[PDB]
Amino acid sequence: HFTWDKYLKETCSVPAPVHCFKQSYTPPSNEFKISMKLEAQDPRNTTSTCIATVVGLTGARLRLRLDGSDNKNDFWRLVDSAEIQPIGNCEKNGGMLQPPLGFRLNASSWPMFLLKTLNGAEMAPIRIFHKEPPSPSHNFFKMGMKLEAVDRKNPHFICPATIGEVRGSEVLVTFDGWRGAFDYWCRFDSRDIFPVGWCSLTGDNLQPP
Ligand SMILES: [Cl-]
Ligand SMILES: [Cl-]
Ligand SMILES: [Cl-]
Ligand SMILES: [Cl-]
Ligand SMILES: [Cl-]
Ligand SMILES: [Cl-]
């Protein structure tokens, strides 16, 4: 069975300290239920706010699906992610919700679809959306430090990863055992990276190398 303790020993490696991450030291509680609806920025068109439904829960994260699209692009968000908001947030602030990329109907049908989707829906309560944790003051990451990162091919999982390079505020995240596949750059304040042990702390899905 994979254990970070044995893994770090075996690989002669060391974890990125917890202060490197925009993650609370005490993970946020998850009071969402499956079927709750909320507002979320479309992961494939992040300028747009759409309706999302909670279709699964794993630890501190929600498995979300944009209403009106298929099941092939589900995305995962922390319960303290700023990229989700309560229903009503957009319109309260003078905005308009937008259809999801891959909306199965035509554009002209979106307003009808939004109305009928929300009528009789369980809205996630405003109170269960957690404020984001504070950002680190700067990029504490160092090349070679180990961490956990959302599995970019299947975000259901979180994977052991290593810092490949640091450039200013950016880090190159590399997935252990993947031989360079799905290497990607993110800013040090990314919500998709976590200190070692965050999966076991929160009850999430850690995929061994
Ligand atoms: Cl922090
Ligand atoms: Cl609000
Ligand atoms: Cl209508
Ligand atoms: Cl629905
Ligand atoms: Cl009714
Ligand atoms: Cl630099």
Side-chain angles (χ1 to χ4, degrees), residues 2-209:
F2 179 94
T3 292
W4 270 109
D5 268 349
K6 181 57 171 292
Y7 187 59
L8 287 165
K9 284 209 58 167
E10 279 184 315
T11 63
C12 301
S13 289
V14 302
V18 296
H19 67 211
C20 299
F21 304 84
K22 190 172 173 74
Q23 301 293 358
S24 296
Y25 295 178
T26 300
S29 60
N30 186 343
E31 299 149 80
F32 288 82
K33 300 175 155 205
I34 292 181
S35 84
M36 287 183 172
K37 299 197 194 284
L38 50 120
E39 299 178 353
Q41 282 62 61
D42 181 341
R44 297 192 294 171
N45 179 34
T46 46
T47 194
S48 277
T49 306
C50 310
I51 300 294
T53 297
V54 179
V55 296
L57 300 164
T58 182
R61 299 195 297 150
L62 312 175
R63 180 177 177 145
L64 301 171
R65 183 170 302 150
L66 299 183
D67 291 64
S69 69
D70 57 38
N71 68 10
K72 292 186 275 208
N73 298 277
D74 291 357
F75 60 108
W76 281 247
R77 296 289 177 259
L78 288 159
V79 298
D80 64 6
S81 171
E83 296 182 353
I84 63 171
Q85 307 89 39
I87 282 159
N89 182 250
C90 187
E91 66 211 349
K92 181 168 66 137
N93 291 119
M96 280 186 69
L97 292 188
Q98 298 270 62
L101 192 35
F103 183 47
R104 76 177 78 92
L105 307 181
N106 51 21
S108 46
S109 298
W110 169 252
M112 173 283 303
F113 182 85
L114 175 54
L115 182 75
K116 68 99 174 182
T117 297
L118 293 186
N119 182 301
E122 183 164 339
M123 308 185 286
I126 291 163
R127 68 153 197 297
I128 70 169
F129 291 81
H130 286 265
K131 193 169 37 73
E132 322 169 79
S135 302
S137 58
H138 68 278
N139 192 348
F140 286 93
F141 289 107
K142 303 295 178 190
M143 183 163 54
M145 281 177 169
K146 290 213 184 280
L147 61 143
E148 290 179 7
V150 175
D151 181 332
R152 229 148 130 105
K153 63 102 171 65
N154 179 5
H156 169 89
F157 294 102
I158 288 171
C159 298
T162 302
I163 301 301
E165 189 168 312
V166 176
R167 290 188 192 172
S169 307
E170 304 289 297
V171 296
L172 182 67
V173 175
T174 69
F175 291 91
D176 288 19
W178 292 26
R179 301 167 64 208
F182 292 88
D183 277 8
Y184 74 101
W185 290 94
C186 69
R187 204 159 74 176
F188 65 87
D189 64 343
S190 175
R191 310 302 316 288
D192 296 336
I193 54 170
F194 313 91
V196 301
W198 188 92
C199 278
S200 54
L201 188 63
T202 59
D204 216 312
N205 313 129
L206 183 78
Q207 177 90 291

